[PDB]
Write a protein that binds this DNA or RNA. Structure first.
Ligand SMILES: [Mg+2]
Ligand SMILES: [Mg+2]
Ligand SMILES: [Mg+2]
Ligand SMILES: [Mg+2]
Ligand SMILES: [Mg+2]
Ligand SMILES: [Mg+2]
Ligand SMILES: [Mg+2]
Ligand SMILES: [Mg+2]
Ligand SMILES: [Mg+2]
Ligand SMILES: [Mg+2]
Ligand SMILES: [Mg+2]
Ligand SMILES: [Mg+2]
Ligand SMILES: [Mg+2]
Ligand SMILES: [Mg+2]
Ligand SMILES: [Mg+2]
Ligand SMILES: [Mg+2]
Ligand SMILES: [Mg+2]
Ligand SMILES: [Mg+2]
Ligand SMILES: [Mg+2]
Ligand SMILES: [Mg+2]
Lengths: 157, 169, 294, 208, 68
RNA sequence: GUCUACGGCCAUACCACCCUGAACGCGCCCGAUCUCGUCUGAUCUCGGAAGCUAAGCAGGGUCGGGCCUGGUUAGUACUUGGAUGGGAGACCGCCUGGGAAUACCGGGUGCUGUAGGCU
RNA sequence: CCGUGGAGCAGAAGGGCAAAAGCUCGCUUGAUCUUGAUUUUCAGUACGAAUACAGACCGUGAAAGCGGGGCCUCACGAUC
RNA sequence: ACGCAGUUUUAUCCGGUAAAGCGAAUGAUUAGAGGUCUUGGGGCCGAAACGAUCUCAACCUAUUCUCAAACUUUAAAUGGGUAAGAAGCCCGGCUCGCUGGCGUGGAGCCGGGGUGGAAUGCGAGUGCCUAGUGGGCCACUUUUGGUAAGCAGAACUGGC
């Protein structure tokens, strides 16, 4: 009964936020959208030709097809039944890269360099990403000044 | 002691606003043709008065912009008609002044009885070398503060050239 | 007392662009001139940027990256005395000459010298550069006239004609070259060759020498005060095009360094600014102490 | 006139007078200052303000009756132009009425469930000031008694506080007499202008 | 005879009765939905790979076996 | 230390006012016979180069307005989860975690790619 | 002269737009034919709408490119 | 070892609610001050006179009071998507009727090299056939209409 048409809840989401109204920058176009690139979706208000849908905003997908002045992305969308991989045709202006895969490739390159150094010098490296360890038995310093005594203040309106 | 910063005539506007379209407006355009030797250009709507009977897109007025020595000659004829006596409120804050005349055959033109007795608005703007910046297509820049023409500069121009009288009353 | 001019206008003012506030771009034509279709992912879109300025014109071929526009080749009008054309640096002949210099310099940089001769004898026809099988193909470039209004006779099309006769495959029409009649749809090539060679301004120099020598001495002064006569101009541009097509190599200038400078006035520091403020405070207190008593 | 036993603490979103309502009648209160409206800042030193405790809704008719009672006690105590009272609270929340029996079961049912605008109340947060009275130093108890007479009339529980500030301004009365004289604060009618140091020098030249 | 209109209550629990499934297995991704000019590239490229790859790859395999 | 042409970041780079500009360059400027389009060579095109940094432009400044950033506001308003906590309600307090913004004050105001020329 | 959208974009509102998607001028019907894919509603069925393509004939533009109706969100219909 | 998760961690995007603000746009709204352009209404110098004066009305500037589910500069908590490898990384070479200055770019194909790649828990994937179900209710929290209901209607979770 909410009149389920296209973009019935997009008063804010497909809007340019503040001090950004105008022509689109050209570095949005001048990007390398090859196949297999993990990209993100963020709709634009200026270009009304290729915004995907209000349901795919903020999602993350994989490129399968590239054309003249758009791109094709497969996106895992959740519905009532189960999540499904869906094929969308989105223009270039709505799409940016995802730096998480780039950070993972940087970690893979650093691990390969550490493994090359390990095979060279015979030194074990422990290249697994361990989480935040518990704090070691470290040592504090209280020289010069006594610890400052804190007391709670009285109530004043 | 002033490097090429000289006040000169940028253009000269000629306007006749007739309360109807057709014969009288066409003869007013013929009068402006007899003055200038070039054809006028017409005006139109954005208002409908209904008090005296004009409508949308009617040719209400004729006007023409004259530049150069012909503009200086028509300015000389207009100040000869007025005998060089403007008022204080003619000069605008941007340094431009208009006065207008009635009895348009006072400029020295042989009157035909078939045309009619009209009048003509005279409006003068002043110019300095460097005002093509705000009008050229490529780099429309600002004019400036020390370069723009003011009330005092315009009235001192009219005191210096043509030997005019201010009449501040 | 009248107007509510600027209260939050400065706070909600959206600036357009640096180059647009300078007045050098539009970007509504640049978004279509520059950006390559994404079926290629790396192929640069070569653009001949022809900019007409006073006393010099610039003809370049460049492409785009995300960091900035990489210029492949460039040519300027002020090197035409070194390439043969001593005077007349901003004419249609210099536009055609700069386009020919730019095309020959680009093909010399790419090494495509012996093939793709283009149009040696300047005729003014619609010579379209074709590709030769078994050889590297033609150079596909596209125009950039900029903010100039492209009416028939604009010398950005003369630079285009110079590039095409030098051998740069640029798609173009014949209805914007000078000599195209507006009413009659037929194109005239003899008038266009005449306007390349600069014989109409030779006729205007004849017109000034016949009618009024005062204007002929007022303007055209560098011409008559070194040497210009129309038969030598008609031979001079014909020799200059051959002299450019035989040696486009662009010998540069050394320019080591000259370590002498005092021109730009530097900034002043925070303490210097605050002490200027403090000296203004102290001088106004001295004024209120002295001039109110005296 | 329905009681305030039924229109009560905040249970709905604020529904103000706007383009979408277009059916609200006129509010009960129209004015908000009753004492010396053109009073200078140094005339009345202190002020007492009425702090709420319950997150409630105060009606405009209750604000009317309270300001009439406080004005009457002030003109009985300190006479005309010996006080300045300001109702800090402004009514914007428009309540709705679903009236029936326009006496049988045969007019409507719960068919049209949305109501018509009856009156205007004002949403009150905890700690929000209802009224503020500025007077002299010797009129400390009269402000307390007037806000007590308003306390007997407003619903719920609320307290009183004599402010540390100098009247309606946000600056302290302990620093007011020390700091209006040297540099910064300049009197502007009943308000006080605070100048920063981030001004043009012509303002400092026009001052001092 | 008014009934309850619409609800999503007791729905996520029915979703998680059977463990909502990723597709989770697509090796050698499907090819339909891709540019027909790219397919006119790729099919002719694949059949000429099937035709003319023998001798140069064979000599390259012999060369890399001799050099490694 | 700079400028020109094309730009990327899109006000740290806009707006108002006042100073400085030696060399190229950028421009104002000088005129309509051809290409050109207008009522007007005002705008756009055609061959310039007699003067000029007056203007654009490029630097510096304003206890400048805005913008960005940092303290204060503030562990405050809020908020995931919990109680056989309080209170008639209104709401409030606590355990566990996350944690915002305006007034107020302080600092800055362009960084760079390609190609080319002047000290 | 100031004038960042305070106007206009056929109409109810929302988003968006300044050498522009607004106003004016000059040509033109791409509001053409055809096969697939996808989004929307969704049961991942249909209709309507829309998107990115592909193949012909084309329109404009100097070319870049843009256009297979309206700047976008609706304005419409199974068997027989 | 393969793989999975109503989960956490490390990175990367998404939003516009709670809050806060309107001396910031839109819409409302209170009060005082300063300035003097404009018109309208009173009083004064006195033939009348923007010749001159005081007040008021409107206007502007700096302030100040209170808000907005269909307002917003800013903007939480909670939450949603993605990556955390042998299906990955690199090297060499063929094909293309796609593209094209270029053996240029991109896809496909072939051969080779090294698996110890965040925590915790669990053995997983898939095919067929089909009953019943399609009248619900209550509670913490967030909320719509109503004065309120053991009232009617929604969101998460749990229970009957
Ligand atoms: Mg254009
Ligand atoms: Mg049911
Ligand atoms: Mg002519
Ligand atoms: Mg002509
Ligand atoms: Mg001129
Ligand atoms: Mg100067
Ligand atoms: Mg200058
Ligand atoms: Mg500066
Ligand atoms: Mg500042
Ligand atoms: Mg809680
Ligand atoms: Mg302007
Ligand atoms: Mg609209
Ligand atoms: Mg097509
Ligand atoms: Mg919302
Ligand atoms: Mg709120
Ligand atoms: Mg059964
Ligand atoms: Mg049943
Ligand atoms: Mg119920
Ligand atoms: Mg029931
Ligand atoms: Mg049970």
């Amino acid at each position: 009964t909410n009149t389920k048409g296209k973009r019935r809840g997009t008063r804010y989401m497909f809007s340019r936020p503040f001090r950004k109204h105008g022509v689109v920058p050209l570095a949005t176009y001048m990007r390398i959208y090859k196949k297999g690139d993990i990209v993100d979706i963020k709709g634009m208000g200026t270009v009304q030709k290729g915004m995907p849908h209000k349901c795919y905003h903020g999602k993350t997908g994989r490129v399968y097809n590239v054309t003249q002045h758009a791109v094709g992305i497969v996106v895992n969308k959740q519905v009532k039944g189960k999540i499904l991989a869906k094929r969308i045709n989105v223009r270039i202006e709505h799409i940016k890269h995802s730096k998480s895969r780039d950070s993972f490739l940087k970690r893979v390159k650093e691990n390969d360099q550490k493994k090359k150094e390990a095979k060279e010098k015979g030194t074990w490296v422990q290249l697994k990403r361990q989480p935040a360890p518990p704090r070691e038995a470290h040592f504090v310093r209280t020289n010069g000044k006594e610890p400052e005594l804190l007391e709670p203040i009285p109530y004043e309106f | 002691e002033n490097p090429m910063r000289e006040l000169r005539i940028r253009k000269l506007c000629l306007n006749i606003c007739v309360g109807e379209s057709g014969d009288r407006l066409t003869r007013a355009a013929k009068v402006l043709e007899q003055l200038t030797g070039q054809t006028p250009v017409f005006s139109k709507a954005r208002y409908t008065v209904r008090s005296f009977g004009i409508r949308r897109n009617e040719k209400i007025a004729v006007h023409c912009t004259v530049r150069g020595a012909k503009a200086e000659e028509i300015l000389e004829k207009g100040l000869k008609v007025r005998e060089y006596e403007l008022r204080k409120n003619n000069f605008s804050d941007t340094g431009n002044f208009g006065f207008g005349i009635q009895e348009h055959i006072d400029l020295g033109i042989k009157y035909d009885p078939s045309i009619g007795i009209y009048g003509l608005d005279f409006y003068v703007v002043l110019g300095r070398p460097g005002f093509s910046i705000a009008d050229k297509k490529r780099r429309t820049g600002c004019i400036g503060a020390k370069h723009r023409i003011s009330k005092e500069e315009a009235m001192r121009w009219f005191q210096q050239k043509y030997d005019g009288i201010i009449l501040p009353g | 007392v009248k107007v509510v001019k600027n209260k939050a206008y400065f706070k909600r003012y959206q600036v357009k662009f640096r180059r647009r506030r300078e007045g050098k771009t539009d970007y509504y034509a640049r978004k279509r001139l520059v950006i390559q279709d994404k079926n290629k992912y790396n192929t640069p879109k070569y653009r001949m940027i022809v900019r007409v300025t006073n006393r010099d014109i610039i003809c370049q071929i460049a492409y785009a990256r995300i960091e900035g526009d990489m210029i492949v080749c460039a040519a300027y009008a002020h090197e035409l005395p070194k390439y043969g054309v001593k005077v007349g640096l901003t004419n249609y002949a210099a536009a055609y000459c700069t386009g020919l210099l730019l095309a020959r310099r680009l093909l010399n940089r790419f090494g495509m010298d012996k093939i793709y001769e283009g149009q040696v004898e300047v005729t003014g026809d619609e010579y379209n550069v074709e590709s030769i099988d078994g050889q590297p193909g033609a150079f596909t470039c596209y125009l950039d006239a900029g903010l100039a209004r492209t009416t028939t006779g604009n010398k950005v099309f003369g630079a285009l004609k110079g590039a095409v006769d030098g051998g740069l495959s640029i798609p173009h029409s014949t209805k914007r070259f000078p000599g195209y009649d507006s009413e009659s749809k037929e194109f005239n090539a003899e008038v266009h060759r005449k306007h390349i060679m600069g014989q109409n301004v030779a006729d205007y120099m004849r017109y000034l020498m016949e009618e009024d020598e005062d204007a002929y001495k007022k303007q055209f002064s560098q011409y008559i005060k070194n040497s210009v006569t129309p038969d030598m101009m008609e031979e001079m541009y014909k020799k200059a095009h051959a002299a450019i097509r035989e040696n486009p190599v662009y010998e540069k200038k050394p320019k080591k360094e000259v370590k002498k400078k005092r021109w730009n006035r530097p900034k002043m520091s925070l303490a210097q600014k605050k002490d200027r403020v403090a000296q203004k405070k102290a001088s106004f207190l001295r004024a209120q102490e002295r001039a109110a008593e005296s | 006139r329905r009681p305030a036993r039924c229109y009560r603490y905040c249970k709905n979103k604020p529904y103000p007078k706007s383009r979408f309502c277009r059916g609200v009648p006129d509010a009960k209160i129209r004015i908000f200052d009753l004492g010396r409206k053109k009073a200078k800042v140094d005339e009345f030193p202190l002020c007492g303000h009425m702090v709420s405790d319950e997150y409630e809704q105060l009606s405009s008719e209750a604000l009317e009756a309270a300001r009439i009672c406080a004005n009457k006690y002030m003109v009985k105590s300190c006479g005309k132009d010996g006080f300045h009272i300001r109702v800090r609270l402004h009514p914007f929340h428009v309540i709705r009425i679903n009236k029936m029996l326009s006496a049988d079961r045969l007019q409507t049912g719960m068919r049209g469930a949305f109501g018509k605008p009856q009156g205007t109340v004002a949403r009150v947060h905890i700690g929000q000031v209802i009224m503020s009275i500025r007077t002299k130093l010797q009129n400390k108890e009269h402000v307390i008694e007037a806000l007590r007479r308003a306390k007997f009339k407003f619903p719920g529980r609320q307290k009183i506080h004599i402010s540390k500030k100098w009247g309606f301004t946000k600056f302290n009365a302990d620093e007011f007499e020390d700091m209006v004289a040297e540099k910064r604060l300049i009197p502007d009618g009943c308000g006080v202008k605070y100048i920063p140091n981030r001004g043009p020098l012509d303002k400092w030249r026009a001052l001092h | 005879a008014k009934s309850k209109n619409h609800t999503t209550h007791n729905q996520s629990r029915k979703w998680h009765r059977n463990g909502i499934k990723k597709p989770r297995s697509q090796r050698y991704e499907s090819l339909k939905g891709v540019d027909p000019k790219f397919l006119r590239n790729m099919r002719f490229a694949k059949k000429h790979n099937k035709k003319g790859l023998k001798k140069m790859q064979a000599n390259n395999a012999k060369a890399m076996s001799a050099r490694a």
